[PDB]
Design a protein around this ligand. Structure first.
Ligand code: XN3
Lengths: 99, 99
């Protein structure tokens, strides 16, 4: 798909067998989802952005379908305003910026 | 050009006669630049990012050249760890997300 940016670049994702709305975010190094339950062992991690740092749970090697494309990588879960798919997964689906 | 996401999508920009490095961020609604004293009037504003809200100064109709392409729009100035080009400017240079 080719996506314009006049509107937030949101796509549907399926994870843990559940559907969710996520934002394709080229400025995010990692992927972070709102608080939710994921199977598997998690490790406490901290990530920072604008506003400061937050504490999150890191789940490794999680399968996730992003708008029909398949990826398997690290997924962070914590107090974020919205689900964000970062560069770690975006590259897995051959996502690029063009103009 | 086509920008890959293996690394942060950093490009050179020109604003206020100064050259800077800025991140092409599809997840940012607005454009936020590191502290710099631009001439002109501005209005106070609050923007939220991952770690909370930060107070910024909003300047309107600022000419900015992104990787050679010209654009003009609202730019927020404040204590951000990096310069961020949001969708308000990305749509002006015809930037798209592709996969
Ligand atoms: C207009 C601003 C700029 C304030 N927008 C954002 O920060 C939005 C916020 N939403 C959320 C939002 C939505 C709506 C809101 C709100 C916040 O507040 C009020 O309304 C979540 C997505 N971000 C976009 C991020 O792409 C920005 C990016 C900035 C950055 C890059 C590099 C170093 C420091 C800061 C960012 O936060 N990046 C970090 C990042 C992000 C995720 C996972 C790992 C990492 C590390 C790092 O790359």
């Amino acid at each position: 798909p080719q996506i314009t940016l006049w509107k937030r670049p949101l796509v549907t994702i399926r994870i843990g067998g559940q559907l969710k709305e996520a934002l394709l975010d080229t400025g995010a190094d990692d992927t972070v989802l709102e608080e939710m339950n994921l199977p598997g062992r998690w490790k406490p991690k901290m990530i920072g952005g604008i506003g400061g740092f937050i504490k999150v749970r890191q789940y490794d090697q999680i399968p996730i379908e992003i708008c029909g494309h398949k990826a398997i990588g690290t997924v962070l879960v914590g107090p974020t305003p919205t689900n964000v798919i970062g560069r770690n997964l975006l590259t897995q689906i051959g996502c690029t910026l063009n103009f």
